[PDB]
Amino acid sequence: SGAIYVGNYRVVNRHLATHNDWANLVWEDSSRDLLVSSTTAQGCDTIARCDCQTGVYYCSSRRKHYPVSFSKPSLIFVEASEYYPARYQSHLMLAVGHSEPGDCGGILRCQHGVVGIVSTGGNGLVGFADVRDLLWLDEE
Numbered sequence: 451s452g453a454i455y456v457g458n459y460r461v462v463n464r465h466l467a468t469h470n471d472w473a474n475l476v477w478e479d480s481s482r483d484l485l486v487s488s489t490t491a492q493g494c495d496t497i498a499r500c501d502c503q504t505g506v507y508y509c510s511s512r513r514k515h516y517p518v519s520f521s522k523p524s525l526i527f528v529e530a531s532e533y534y535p536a537r538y539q540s541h542l543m544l545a546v547g548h549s550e551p552g553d554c555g556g557i558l559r560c561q562h563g564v565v566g567i568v569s570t571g572g573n574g575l576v577g578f579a580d581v582r583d584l585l586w587l588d589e590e
């Protein structure tokens with residue numbers, strides 16, 4: 451579990467979004483595994499605006515943050531998980547690291563701020579849903 455709190459937005463994995471998220475929906479995309487809802491209180495996070503390929507992510511199933519190199523966001527085949535079928539997912543980056551289903555929502559960060567959240571795992575990789583292209587998160 452986990453979210454990004456930027457401005458008056460909450461960014462969560464689409465598959466973990468709550469009823470309140472859907473009732474306060476700003477934007478969602480199944481292909482990216484993302485959903486954004488509106489918040490009453492402003493949030494503490496800053497979104498990275500960059501093309502870094504190195505950062506640090508939080509792994510809840512290890513209680514640890516790990517430094518990683520990661521691929522640029524792309525369209526990637528993802529094998530079946532407990533929460534999605536095998537399918538293509540867009541806006542995805544990959545690193546070598548540990549990720550189980552409940553690690554989704556852990557932040558990946560670089561020197562510029564939050565890059566994305568854990569969204570995929572298995573076979574010794576961790577996949578992150580990018581948010582650095584969502585420039586509208588920084589306003590309004």
Ligand SMILES: CC[C@@H]1CN(S(=O)(=O)N(C)C)CCO1
Pocket residue numbers: 523524525526539540541542
């Ligand atoms: C040639 C396909 C893809 C699309 N991606 S993407 O935006 O990250 N996304 C999956 C749409 C970037 C690289 O090229």
Ligand SMILES: [Zn+2]
Pocket residue numbers: 498499500501502560561562563
């Ligand atoms: Zn960066």
